[PDB]
Amino acid sequence: MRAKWRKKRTRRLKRKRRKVRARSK
Amino acid sequence: TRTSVLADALNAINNAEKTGKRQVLIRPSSKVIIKFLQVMQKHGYIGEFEYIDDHRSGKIVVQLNGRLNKCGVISPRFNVKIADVEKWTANLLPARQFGYVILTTSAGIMDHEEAHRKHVSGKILGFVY
Amino acid sequence: PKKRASNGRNKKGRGHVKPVRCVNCSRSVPKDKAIKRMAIRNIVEAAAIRDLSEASVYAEYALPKTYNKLHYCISCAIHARIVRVRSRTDRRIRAPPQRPRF
Amino acid sequence: EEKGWVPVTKLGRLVKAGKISSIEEIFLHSLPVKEFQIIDQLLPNLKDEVMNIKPVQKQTRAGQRTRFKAVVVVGDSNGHVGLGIKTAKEVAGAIRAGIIIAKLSVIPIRRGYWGTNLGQPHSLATKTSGKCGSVSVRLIPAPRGSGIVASPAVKKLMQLAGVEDVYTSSTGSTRTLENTLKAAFVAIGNTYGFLTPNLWEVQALTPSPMDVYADYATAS
Amino acid sequence: MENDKGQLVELYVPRKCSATNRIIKAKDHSSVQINIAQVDEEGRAIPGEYVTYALSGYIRARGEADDSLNRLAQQDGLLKNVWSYSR
Amino acid sequence: GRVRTKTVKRASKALIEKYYPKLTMDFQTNKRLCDEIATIQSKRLRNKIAGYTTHLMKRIQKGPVRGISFKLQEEERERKDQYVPDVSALDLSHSNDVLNVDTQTAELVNSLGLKLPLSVSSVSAVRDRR
Amino acid sequence: GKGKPRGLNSARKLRVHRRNNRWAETTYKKRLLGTAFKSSPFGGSSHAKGIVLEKIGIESKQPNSAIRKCVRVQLIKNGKKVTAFVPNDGCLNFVD
Amino acid sequence: SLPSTFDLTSEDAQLLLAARVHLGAKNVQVHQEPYVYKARPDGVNVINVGKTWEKIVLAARIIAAIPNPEDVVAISSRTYGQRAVLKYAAHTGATPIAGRFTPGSFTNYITRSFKEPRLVIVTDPRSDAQAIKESSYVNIPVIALTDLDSPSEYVDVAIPCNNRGKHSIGLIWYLLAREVLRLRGALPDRTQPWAIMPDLYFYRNPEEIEQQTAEEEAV
RNA sequence: AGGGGAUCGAAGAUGAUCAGAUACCGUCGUAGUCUUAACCAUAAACUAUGCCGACUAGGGAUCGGGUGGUGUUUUUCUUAUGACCCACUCGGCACCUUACGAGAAAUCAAAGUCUUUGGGUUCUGGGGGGAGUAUGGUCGCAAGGCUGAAACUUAAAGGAAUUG
Ligand SMILES: [Mg+2]
Ligand SMILES: [Mg+2]
Ligand SMILES: [Mg+2]
Ligand SMILES: [Mg+2]
Ligand SMILES: [Mg+2]
Ligand SMILES: [Mg+2]
Ligand SMILES: [Mg+2]
Ligand SMILES: [Mg+2]
Ligand SMILES: [Mg+2]
Ligand SMILES: [Mg+2]
Ligand SMILES: [Mg+2]
Ligand SMILES: [Mg+2]
Ligand SMILES: [Mg+2]
Ligand SMILES: [Mg+2]
Ligand SMILES: [Mg+2]
Ligand SMILES: [Mg+2]
Ligand SMILES: [Zn+2]
Q1: Which nucleotide lies nearest residue B19, CA to C1'?
Q2: Do chains G and B meet with 3 or more Cβ pairs nearer than 8 Å?
Q3: The domain at D109-202 falls in which architecture?
């Protein structure tokens, strides 16, 4: 990927992880 | 700013010798620079140099001879015992036949050979050869 | 590797420059790196001056010229032959191409 | 080996005539050399030794051209060195041209004393540096009997030089043998190019050997 | 340089730049050995008699060889008021 | 298509350089000359030599050309070079016996301390658009 | 120049600077963090004893075509399971 | 030193000034030359003719030093002075190179144009830069007829004069010829004007040689 | 959040190409684009060149300032201006040639005065991935920012130029 896209995909994964964490808490 | 006046002086003399000049203008002058110049003059690496008063800070006009190849200041005036001076003269001076580590003792500013003969040692000023 | 010393942009001391739009692909490009051409032409071509001159009530009327500055994007201009690739040693020749009309 | 050697260049004519006695006056006046016969004649004992044969490969659209870089060093082990690098197609011609180039590129060195001069100099007269490419070699004087401390290539070059003892310090990628040899050669040739207080007396500029015997040259 | 006994053990004593007192290397292939023949009283050049100048390759490549040579000639009194020690 | 490749050019140049006085304008004469003063394997090659040498003859009779240098044309050079006007252009003769210069060079002459006829006249400091 | 402090009274900054930049070397970081103890299969140890669990023929890398016969072993010192190679031709059949 | 017979005569200074040697320098000036005298308000630096002539006599001594005349080679690629170079080399035993230099003639020893002269003279450094470089490569002095804008690399004796006017270069070549001939000894003494008059050195362009050919054939 | 609301326009609505096209092209079109307070603190925020000093090489120009010109026009009869021309100087964006030094070079008048290694100083990097990820802090309403690993894996990744 472009490093730009890798960063964006990682950001979306972080967003999903934070949503799951907020649901769990 | 201009931290070490002698560093400026020796940088100027080295640059001009490399360039090929026969005279340099050391812009700010100081007692320590004068003594450095006296040492090099006594040993012959310099020709006839002249001081100029300006009521603010002296200027120096040094007539070289091209015999000099490279001077240089050891800017942090390190402390050298009478034993470590051999290490310093091995590190800086090319060969033990010639070359002088100009250093300041309580007896005055003077090269390493005279300093050894007087059996004194102080802080290192620079190296000339 | 540095393709050009002047970066092919020609600012060197302004941080940022206002951008202007291409006239062919409507690209926003900085005005300095905008490879501009002044297109001074007549309203009629050389093949029509005769008919207009003979179909004119004014005998000595001289037809006026149309003026406009053209700001290209770089890609359109490399495509539209107005700007030409050069050999590496000939890149640095800044002077405009020598006038063929000598 | 038919050393017929029709001499072109004035120096060749002079040395064939015998008016040139030693390479001393050759190096005295920055006298250029273009014929290897001259250096062969003045110093008849140039030991040679090839140092490397590196195959290099250029590529055109059909196959690969394979040439050979021969790197050779020559000397007399008595204060004269010469480096020769040359590319060629066949090996024998490669080493031949390389040794010719080395003989042209011969250089005197300045063997000095580590301290308390006794008998004969063994090491260099001073610390020296030589940088080619990114390889920078430092030649620093050695006490008697310390040996030639260097990589095998530089060690063998110094052996052909004639120095008995010297310490070395290489920096960069000395891996590239050709660059290392060039750097060491430049450093060891620089030994003269350094004003030493024992070499301070102003000389009288003895007349050049070309001028005094210019009549002998220009064969007619 | 000099052996303990007192023999010139150094290989060869090289010349020096007559303008800058800098050493002239063996392969310093830009240096020049300028000769100036002496002249007698009535205006003839004495053969085989000449003053010498050795100009280093470096100064020649710099382009200041003319200035140094002119200065040397005036210091030797071969040129009359051509160089000014004050410029 | 007939371009007379390397060999005929070289041979012709060498022949003219070496044997100028004994080459003529006629083709067949030069053919026989090149036959006698050069060893040529095939007759066609010698014919081409003769042709281009005749071309060189015509060129040299028109005027001296580049590259070629025979001894006789050095005599034409001697004649043209040795010509000289009897009256110098410089020797204070033209422009009504006047050396027309400006003030600074007059000061130069006076400073050198020698007597020269001068005619001082200042030049306007104005610089035109050019 | 040489943008590290150089005055006499700058021993502190140079010392802390070197202590901080020493964390770049992999060997120094491994030594200080004790990675050879906490996480390495061997506790900073050259050898250790273990028990064979089963035998595996691992296929080689790209240019090499062969199977390298290894054995999975559970270490007896801590219990971590790890594969291990067996040298020479007729040796896997020698491993009971 | 040189005796007072080696001073500048009124005749020679008159000849120099008439040739407009003093008007050579252009608007641009390089710090390589202190030969300037004054800056004309029109914008022409004026060359100090005395120092010039002194450079000529120094150069004449330089050439007189070398015993073998063909070891002096006079080079010119500029049209304005190639004829003067030819004539100079004809008068002395120097060897002339006119126009194209055939680069590599000093270094490559196989070349048939190989010349290895102990001295070389160059009409113009800007034009004969290749000659300067190839003289540097094999340790040769160059007595270059510099201008006050000609660059001074590798030139040892720089004779300042005009190089934009053919009169100046022709006359300066003649002066150098006269002085080297006098110092050689064949000429008896340095008081009479030389038998060969200076304008025989000036450049002859094709239209002028055409006019003179017509005049000579007229009789 | 509040005021705007023309153009342009992410999302979308579509009309075509395409094997597929919720992409390139064409029509519309919300948020934004513009503002007022409050946040955010990231960009190839690039000259990919930290700052302050001294020295080293020539060339014109250009901008601002100051000097002189019996300078040129101007015109208010003329001074005085102003605008120009010439020379110099201080400071700035740069540019041109060159290396004598530098670099692995491409190139640099600083990236020089660095093995002949030291003018004063902050901040970074130590093979490539893993990864600017996990975790822990802290800032932020949120997006995210700052700080920031390791296990493991790999023999290269990469720079510059050369020939195809
Ligand atoms: Mg103080
Ligand atoms: Mg690219
Ligand atoms: Mg600014
Ligand atoms: Mg297998
Ligand atoms: Mg709103
Ligand atoms: Mg859409
Ligand atoms: Mg659709
Ligand atoms: Mg719309
Ligand atoms: Mg950032
Ligand atoms: Mg950055
Ligand atoms: Mg910054
Ligand atoms: Mg890593
Ligand atoms: Mg990463
Ligand atoms: Mg956290
Ligand atoms: Mg990259
Ligand atoms: Mg690449
Ligand atoms: Zn466009």
Answers
A1: I56
A2: yes
A3: 2-Layer Sandwich (3.30)
For CA atoms H104, H109, H112, H118, the dihedral sign is positive
| Among candidate residues D118, D112, D169, D122, the one with its CA nearest the CA of residue D144 | D122
| Chain C adjacent subunits, 3+ CB pairs under 8 A | none
* Chain G residues near residue B76 by CB distance under 8 angstroms: 6-8
Dihedral (CA of D207, D13, H91, H173) sign: negative
Chain E residues within 8 A of D194 when measuring between CB atoms? 23
Ligand 17 centroid, distance to C42 Cα (angstroms): 24
Q: Is there a contact between B64 and B115 (Cβ–Cβ < 8 Å)? A: no
User: What H or E segment, with its residue span, contains residue H202?
Assistant: none
Q: How far apart are CA B77 and CA B59, in angstroms?
A: 24
Backbone angles phi, psi at A24, to 5 degrees: -65, -40
Q: Go through chain D and list every residue after which a break occurs, taking a C to next N gap over 2.5 angstroms, comma-separated.
A: none
Chain H neighbours (≥3 Cβ pairs under 8 A) are D, E, F
Using DSSP, state whether F69 is helix, strand or coil: coil
Q: Under 8 Å CB-to-CB from D78, ≥6 apart: which residues?
A: D162
**Ligand 17 center from residue G5 Cα (angstroms):** 53
**Alpha helix positions (H), B51-111:** 84-91
Work out whether strand D148-149 and strand D166-171 pair parallel, antiparallel, or are unpaired.
parallel
Distance CA H108, CA H111 (A): 6
| CA to C1' distance (Å), from H124 to I64 | 42
CATH of the domain at E52: 3.30.1230.20
Measure, in angstroms, how far nucleotide I39 C1' is from residue B66 CA. 68
Of B20, B66, B67, Cβ closest to residue E62: B20
Sole residue written with tokens 């490879």: C35
Q: What is the dihedral of CA C10, C15, C21, C27, to 10 degrees?
A: 90
- CB of D202 within 8 Å of a chain E CB? The answer is yes
Residues in Cβ contact with H166 at an 8 Å cutoff, skipping those fewer than 6 apart: H80, H81, H202, H203
Cβ atoms within 10 Å, residue F3: 6
Q: Which of B27, B2, B1, B22 is nearest to B12 (CA)?
A: B27
Partners of G58 in the β-ladder = G68
Cα–Cα distance measured from residue H161 to residue H177, given in angstroms and rounded to the nearest whole number: 16
Class of domain F1-61: mainly alpha
As assigned by CATH, the class of the H12-207 domain is alpha beta
Chain D residues whose CB is inside 8 A of the E3 CB are: 117, 119-120
Q: D83 a known binding residue?
A: yes
CA separation for the pair F47, F35 (Å, rounded): 9
Instruction: Give the resolution value in Å.
Output: 4.0
| Contacts with E68 (C-beta within 8 Å, 6 or more apart), sequence order | E19, E20, E55, E59
Contacts of B61 (CB under 8 A, 6+ apart): B23, B24, B25, B26, B49, B50, B52
Contact F15, F37 (CB under 8 A): yes
Note the Cα E52 to chain centre separation in Å.
5
Q: Give residue for tokens 């008896």.
A: H188
Touch of H by F (3+ CB pairs closer than 8 Å): yes
Q: Do B66 and E62 touch (CB under 8 A)?
A: no
Is any Cβ of chain B less than 8 angstroms from the Cβ of G2?
no
Burial class, G21, CB count within 10 angstroms (exposed 0-12 / middle 13-18 / buried 19+)? exposed
Amino acid at site H213 = T
Residue D148 CA to residue D167 CA, distance in Å, equals 6
Q: Could H67 and D8 be called an inter-chain contact, meaning their C-beta atoms sit closer than 8 Å?
A: no
The domain D4-108 is placed in CATH, from the list 3.10.490.10, 3.30.160.20, 2.40.110.10, 3.20.20.150, at: 3.30.160.20
